[PDB]
Structures are given as C-alpha cells and as structure tokens.
Design a protein around this motif. Structure first.
Motif, PDB file in Angstrom:
ATOM      1  N   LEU D  11      -4.796  -1.014  -2.725  1.00  0.00           N
ATOM      2  CA  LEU D  11      -4.512  -0.140  -3.859  1.00  0.00           C
ATOM      3  C   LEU D  11      -3.754  -0.894  -4.943  1.00  0.00           C
ATOM      4  O   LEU D  11      -4.056  -0.757  -6.133  1.00  0.00           O
ATOM      5  CB  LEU D  11      -3.706   1.078  -3.403  1.00  0.00           C
ATOM      6  CG  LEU D  11      -4.230   1.956  -2.258  1.00  0.00           C
ATOM      7  CD1 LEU D  11      -3.299   3.136  -1.995  1.00  0.00           C
ATOM      8  CD2 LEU D  11      -5.663   2.420  -2.475  1.00  0.00           C
ATOM      9  N   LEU D  12      -2.764  -1.695  -4.544  1.00  0.00           N
ATOM     10  CA  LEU D  12      -2.023  -2.516  -5.497  1.00  0.00           C
ATOM     11  C   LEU D  12      -2.941  -3.507  -6.197  1.00  0.00           C
ATOM     12  O   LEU D  12      -2.839  -3.707  -7.413  1.00  0.00           O
ATOM     13  CB  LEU D  12      -0.895  -3.262  -4.781  1.00  0.00           C
ATOM     14  CG  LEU D  12       0.311  -2.466  -4.282  1.00  0.00           C
ATOM     15  CD1 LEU D  12       1.469  -3.401  -3.973  1.00  0.00           C
ATOM     16  CD2 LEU D  12       0.724  -1.433  -5.308  1.00  0.00           C
ATOM     17  N   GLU D  14      -6.259  -3.329  -6.742  1.00  0.00           N
ATOM     18  CA  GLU D  14      -7.147  -2.682  -7.704  1.00  0.00           C
ATOM     19  C   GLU D  14      -6.372  -2.097  -8.879  1.00  0.00           C
ATOM     20  O   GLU D  14      -6.882  -2.080 -10.003  1.00  0.00           O
ATOM     21  CB  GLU D  14      -7.996  -1.602  -7.032  1.00  0.00           C
ATOM     22  CG  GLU D  14      -7.225  -0.521  -6.308  1.00  0.00           C
ATOM     23  CD  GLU D  14      -8.054   0.146  -5.231  1.00  0.00           C
ATOM     24  OE1 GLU D  14      -9.214  -0.273  -5.027  1.00  0.00           O
ATOM     25  OE2 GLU D  14      -7.554   1.096  -4.598  1.00  0.00           O
ATOM     26  N   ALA D  15      -5.143  -1.625  -8.649  1.00  0.00           N
ATOM     27  CA  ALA D  15      -4.323  -1.135  -9.752  1.00  0.00           C
ATOM     28  C   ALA D  15      -3.970  -2.260 -10.715  1.00  0.00           C
ATOM     29  O   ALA D  15      -3.991  -2.068 -11.936  1.00  0.00           O
ATOM     30  CB  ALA D  15      -3.057  -0.472  -9.211  1.00  0.00           C
ATOM     31  N   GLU D  16      -3.639  -3.441 -10.187  1.00  0.00           N
ATOM     32  CA  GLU D  16      -3.361  -4.585 -11.050  1.00  0.00           C
ATOM     33  C   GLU D  16      -4.603  -4.996 -11.830  1.00  0.00           C
ATOM     34  O   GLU D  16      -4.519  -5.323 -13.022  1.00  0.00           O
ATOM     35  CB  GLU D  16      -2.831  -5.752 -10.218  1.00  0.00           C
ATOM     36  CG  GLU D  16      -2.290  -6.917 -11.037  1.00  0.00           C
ATOM     37  CD  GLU D  16      -3.362  -7.927 -11.402  1.00  0.00           C
ATOM     38  OE1 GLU D  16      -4.373  -8.012 -10.675  1.00  0.00           O
ATOM     39  OE2 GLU D  16      -3.193  -8.635 -12.418  1.00  0.00           O
TER      40      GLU D  16
END
Lengths: 111, 97, 111, 97
Positions: D11-12, D14-16
């Motif tokens: 998740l981190l 893809e968020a970045e």
C-alpha cells in the motif's frame, strides 16, 4: 443466507474497501508530509535516496526523519516531558507522532 | 497485609502528585480554583485534580500544542496518558519560564 | 439474597470507597507535610529529584527525610527515650510518626 | 499479522507511486486533470491514475511509439504491463527533455 444477510454483507464489504482506500490516501499524505519535512528542515544527507542506498527500510527512514525533526525543533525538556525520557531512539509510534506534531507547531510559531 | 502495605505505598505515590499540583496551582493560576472552594461548589477529589491539571495545561501548554499533541483543541475530554503528557509539558513550560 | 442484604452490601461498598477517598486525602496531607519540611528545614542534596536520580523509592525518600528531621530537631535524649534506641535507621513506622510529630513540636517552639 | 504488514508495505509503495505521478502530472499536463475535480466528475482513484498515466504517455511518448510498442495507436485500451512500459518511456522522455 437471507436477503438482508446478503445486503448487510455487501454493505460491510463496500465499507471495508472504502476504509482501505481512505487508509491508502492517509498513507500517501503521510509520505508527502515526511518528504516535505525532510526537504525543508533537514540536511540532504538524510535523503530517501541516500538512506535507501545505505540500506534502511522506508518506515525506518520515516521514523529517523521524525526523530531528527523532533531533536531539531522540540527542545530536550519538552522531549523529556512528552516521551517521559530523554532518548527518542525507542519512542517511535503514537508518542512519536505527538512529538512531530509538536515539532510542526514549533516551526509554525518560529515562522 | 503486604498487599495493603503496597496499596498504602500507591496512595503515597498518587498523593505526591495530588499535593504538588495543588501547591503549584495556588501560586500559578488563581485562588478561585482552591480545593476548599471547589469542594464547596461540589467537585470530587479526582474532578478537582483533573480540572487543576487541565487549567495548568491551558495556562502553560499553548493551544497549538493542545490541538497537535492531544489531537483536539478542547481539553474537556482528553484525560488519560495524553493528559499526563500535557501536564508534564506544562511542568516543563513553568520550569523554563 | 434479599433486599436488606442488597442494601447493606451497597452501603458497605459506598463506605469502602469513601474510606479510600479519606485515605487519599490523608496521604495527600502527609506528602504535603513531608515536601514542606524537606524544602524548609533540610538541604537541597536531599531533594526528591536527586534522590530519585540516585535510585531510591518514594517511601525511602519519605523515611530518610523524616529521620533527618528527627536527628536535626529532636534531641538525642528524647530519641533514646521515645524510640528506646539511639539509632533511627530501623525505627521507621508509628514510632517514626511520633518522632516527626515531636520534631514538628520542636520547630514550632523554636519559632 | 505479517501478511497485513506486507500488504501495508505494498500500500505504501503504490501510494508513493500515485503521489509521484500526481505531483509530476500537475506540473506537466494541466490543472483540469486534478484529483479533486476528477473525483467531483466521478472517477475512481484507479481510473484517475490510469487516465493521468495515459495523458502522460500522450504528452511525452510519441504517437509512433504508441502505435508500435503498444501495437495500437489509441491508448484507450492498452492498460497493463504495456502501459507500465509506456509510462516508463514517458519518464525517460521527460528526463531527456
């Protein structure tokens, strides 16, 4: 399984996915805030690229930048008050979030 | 009886904070929030202690610190470990003042 | 369990909690007296902060301050009479409370 | 709980990636394709991200590269590993620009 069970299961799944998406947005905002703080208030030697080259996890990078910001802005007495100890090396977590909020307050009042 | 002895030791430990907060608050905040007048107005011991703590936080700890560290601007319902952190911050503020 | 049993149990619990509150008040007065005596009549080296830094329990701090006050104010003859021994290192307790009351009387008559 | 920890790591990541794409797209393409206005118009987050990626490809990657590497001139339905290749080519183009 009845129709009301089907409806409540579908709504529960939809709400769970929406909460996951909101968590994704929150994590993205946290990463953006950490990047901005590192670029603005901390030295270039603590950059994400150089830390990754040295071999540190992303969460380790975030907590190291947070601790450096707390040491730079939040004074040692305030650290000893909020964290109950002088050292910050084992204070990562909700207390660390409180400390970095205090550091943001400190830079806001400094400006 | 050692359980009751340890209970009495805990009584001493919390009583330390109880008396210290009152002694410093009398000289810091006002005489209106004295324990006797608060008891006359009808506030329990714990309520007096938490009210004095919140007033100390409001006096020393700045409002931005309140809304950032405690996540809420109002100290009305923040009591707990966050309140302990806030009163420690107020102690630091009065120490540096 | 009948209603009279219910009422007597409820009153017993309420009285127990009120007794706990009275204990809180009494111990608060005790610690306030100890702090005032330590600040007024004893040196700064016996401060609670420095004693805690040296690693002594709160009860140890209270008894050490009480013994120092007794040695400072109460005469050695009075110590040997009331406590039956010259040494106070093993006289902590109700006899210590009597000795500190005598020390308070001594400082009151000294003033 | 380590499965959820690895999920959160993804998740981190893809968020970045989304944050970087949005930050570069805002300064490169236009303000009309902002996340807020697209959400108001009613596009999901993944749809917004893929539309921004396709606009980046249309801006940097030339149409011949589009119709040959992706085998189709229209980027309308090419999403996938070919879309990743196209956005990497767009990154190369903006780097050399």
């Amino acid at each position: 399984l009845s129709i009301n069970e089907r409806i409540t299961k579908e709504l529960a799944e939809v709400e769970e996915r929406e909460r996951i998406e909101k968590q994704l947005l929150l994590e993205a905002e946290r990463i953006n805030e950490i990047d901005t703080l590192a670029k603005a208030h901390l030295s270039n030697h603590f950059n994400k690229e150089v830390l990754l080259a040295k071999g540190y996890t992303l969460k380790d990078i975030m907590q190291a930048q947070r601790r450096e910001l707390v040491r730079k802005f939040v004074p040692i007495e305030q650290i000893k008050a909020i964290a109950k100890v002088s050292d910050i090396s084992h204070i990562d977590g909700e207390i660390l979030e409180q400390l970095v909020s205090l550091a943001k307050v400190n830079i806001k009042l400094r400006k």
